[PDB]
Amino acid sequence: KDELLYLNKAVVFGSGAFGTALAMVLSKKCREVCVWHMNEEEVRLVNEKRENVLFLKGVQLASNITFTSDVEKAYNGAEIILFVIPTQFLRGFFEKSGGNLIAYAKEKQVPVLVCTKGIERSTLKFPAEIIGEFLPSPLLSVLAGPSFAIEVATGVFTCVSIASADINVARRLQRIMSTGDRSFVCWATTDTVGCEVASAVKNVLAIGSGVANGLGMGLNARAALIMRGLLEIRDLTAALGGDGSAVFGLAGLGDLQLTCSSELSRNFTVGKKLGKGLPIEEIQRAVAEGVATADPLMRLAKQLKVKMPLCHQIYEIVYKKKNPRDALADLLSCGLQDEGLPPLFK
Amino acid sequence: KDELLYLNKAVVFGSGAFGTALAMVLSKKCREVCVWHMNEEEVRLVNEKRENVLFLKGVQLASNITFTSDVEKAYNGAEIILFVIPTQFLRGFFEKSGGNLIAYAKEKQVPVLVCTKGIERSTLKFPAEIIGEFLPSPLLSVLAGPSFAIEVATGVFTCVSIASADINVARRLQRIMSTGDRSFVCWATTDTVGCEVASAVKNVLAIGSGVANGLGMGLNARAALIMRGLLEIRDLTAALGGDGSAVFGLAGLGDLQLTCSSELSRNFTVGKKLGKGLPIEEIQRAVAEGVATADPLMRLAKQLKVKMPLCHQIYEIVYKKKNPRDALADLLSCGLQDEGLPPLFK
Ligand SMILES: NC(=O)c1ccc[n+]([C@@H]2O[C@H](COP(=O)([O-])OP(=O)(O)OC[C@H]3O[C@@H](n4cnc5c(N)ncnc54)[C@H](O)[C@@H]3O)[C@@H](O)[C@H]2O)c1
Ligand SMILES: NC(=O)c1ccc[n+]([C@@H]2O[C@H](COP(=O)([O-])OP(=O)(O)OC[C@H]3O[C@@H](n4cnc5c(N)ncnc54)[C@H](O)[C@@H]3O)[C@@H](O)[C@H]2O)c1
Ligand SMILES: CCCCCCCCCCCCCCC
Ligand SMILES: CCCCCCCCCCCCCCC
């Protein structure tokens, strides 16, 4: 259906930039919107300042958005639940505080939208998979696409995709997340796996995009990294069982191109410094998603016997003090090859 | 084979930036390299200045590169012929001066590489197809990929693809164009049609990327245009008989992302001005490829009953004084849809 759906309440667990940006999106489709944060003193500050000075400074929060550190109040009445908690804290949240919320979720059959992105070190599992350990798959959906928080929060034209096993589940969410002014447009897909893989790998590849820059290469080089790196996301997706229909969609191609062209992103800057020779230790100072993700990505790929050329070299440069230039050469040592893309039309 | 091939002579018909940039690439794989230009007085100047002050200022030409306005001398002895003449002058060249050259080409079975990009107004045909009217298909190959002339001419890491019906023909050329320092890497593909379609459509879409900017949208918007516009190149390719294996390769995704992220390109700037409301007439002042290409692209699409949403609106804004904002709204009037991408894995 091409007609939207408005709700009375919507809860968003994750008080960071993206979660807040999404609260902003929701403020225009939901009568009430609570954003769960943990530090109570902070929850107050924000509500006072009418601004998430913590993770989204400069953005005036809508009035119908309320921050609360009380999970119970937070989810109570919500007709849609969003999870934008960093991957590393996700599991802990459910073990320590998801008790009742999970009950409520199952009870009222509330639709859950996974917005977190990454890989859990301990299990090498993705967000929606982790949450899936507590909440049934049928209720789970994934939101992925080129969506810089700031642009989304301030209402600047953005397109993302909603992935769910049941396309109809994705479409319902599609009608809930899409805004009245068409400033936030959603596209439905079933490729949950592809979306999750892409959301994670993109950060690693972003670092390579930065490496390429600090290494003196230009835009041609970047377009090639983006195009070649996309096959790596494709192959890892295939290995994990995903149908891959999202790989060349907004979740993959889209977000990938965005994330890799973001010259100010921590991923890019970190990679740039590496490209210029600065050791990872020296850099540090606030870790880049790509850096955190690189190790487990490598372990998952290895475990699945999936070859990710670019991602691997990026892992070496980061975790094994490999010279960016040597990495680049090793990468190109493969010799002349075919593009390696199947035809789409017979 | 992963081992290169060096030649004695190579001719490049097309004295513009890209042709010169490619002469530079060839200067490192060919003993001798002539670049055919038409104005004799100019051919001298350049040879004197050791620089193509006409279309590639600031770039010092290698010594083994010689400009000549004598087609006969130019092609004589060449072991590879490149065509980088603008689409509109292509046919005229062969009718007026290709006489002997064609003979020589067929005679010695010299490999031809089509580097020109666009659509001929009169026939709505692409470069390699036009040249194909004079030289047999078997000898023809297409070079396409994200390759800004300057970066290519100055040796900055670049990746492009070589497309030929016979993959082996593409691979031979692959070993001739790939450089010893791995600064120019070629990938083989068969999707000649896809490559040509992509090379042309990209310019139109670039204007939209500019429109989006002048219209106040941000990077999220651009990533979406790139991802959505790519399906248009896909569909037109399917309609023209291409196998489409290049659509998501360097020729398509690659070049597309590059061309659309080039904020200084004439396509972008023209589109930006349109996005800001300036009428096309006013703008002008040196035409943007995207503008020229928009009309025939539209006529070809219509003739083939292929729907290209973004390209169509871009055509309206340019040729029919349509308000960019109205165009954007008409575009989004489609309602909520699925991403519309087939799965890659069953
Ligand atoms: N930032 C973006 O533009 C964007 C776009 C898409 C997806 N994402 C995804 O969003 C998530 C994070 O992005 P962000 O900018 O919203 O977040 P952020 O880094 O601004 O989030 C900080 C959040 O982490 C919590 N936190 C910090 N330390 C904690 C601890 N020890 N225990 C429990 N909670 C703790 C805070 O209370 C807060 O909710 C990731 O999954 C990322 O991939 C971000
Ligand atoms: N510029 C790039 O970075 C790039 C990258 C890929 C493909 N291309 C393709 O290259 C071609 C043009 O790009 P460029 O920068 O090399 O060229 P350019 O615009 O710099 O080329 C000018 C050329 O056109 C010729 N010319 C001009 N007017 C003429 C007339 N009336 N009759 C006959 N010849 C005339 C000149 O003598 C010269 O060879 C297109 O096919 C384009 O799609 C360019
Ligand atoms: C991390 C450094 C910069 C990388 C710039 C891009 C390289 C692109 C091509 C990779 C080809 C891989 C071929 C198979 C092993
Ligand atoms: C030319 C103006 C700016 C366009 C910015 C991008 C719009 C992207 C989405 C297009 C969707 C088309 C849907 C089907 C008709």
Side-chain angles (χ1 to χ4, degrees), chain A residues 157 159 187, chain B residues 207-209 211-212 215 217 221 224-225 228 309-310 313-314 317 324 327-328 330-332 334 337:
Chain A
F157 194 72
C159 284
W187 307 71
Chain B
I207 283 175
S209 183
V211 165
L215 217 52
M217 299 172 179
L225 172 142
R228 297 305 302 179
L310 285 158
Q313 289 304 312
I314 298 179
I317 299 173
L328 183 282
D330 277 343
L331 227 183
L332 304 181
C334 53
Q337 304 183 307

Side-chain angles (χ1 to χ4, degrees), chain A residues 14-25 35 46 49-62 65 67 147-155:
Chain A
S15 57
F18 199 37
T20 297
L22 288 178
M24 289 297 271
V25 179
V35 175
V46 179
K49 297 300 186 66
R50 211 81 302 285
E51 168 191 8
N52 191 318
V53 298
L54 304 165
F55 310 108
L56 200 68
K57 304 177 178 60
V59 179
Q60 269 277 153
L61 297 175
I65 292 176
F67 278 60
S147 57
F148 269 172
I150 189 61
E151 278 178 44
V152 172
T154 65

Side-chain angles (χ1 to χ4, degrees), chain A residues 2 148 151 158 171 174 182 188 219-220 242-243 250 253 257 332 334-339 341 344-345, chain B residues 2 148 151 158 171 174 182 188 219-220 242-243 245 250 253 257 332 334-339 344-345:
Chain A
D2 304 54
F148 269 172
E151 278 178 44
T158 285
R171 288 157 173 174
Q174 172 173 40
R182 307 295 289 173
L219 299 183
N220 287 1
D243 66 66
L250 286 169
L253 161 41
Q257 103 77 33
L332 304 181
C334 53
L336 308 180
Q337 304 183 307
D338 295 343
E339 195 137 59
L341 276 177
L344 307 177
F345 320 111
Chain B
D2 304 54
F148 269 172
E151 278 178 44
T158 285
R171 288 157 173 174
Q174 172 173 40
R182 307 295 289 173
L219 299 183
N220 287 1
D243 66 66
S245 60
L250 286 169
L253 161 41
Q257 103 77 33
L332 304 181
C334 53
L336 308 180
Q337 304 183 307
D338 295 343
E339 195 137 59
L344 307 177
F345 320 111

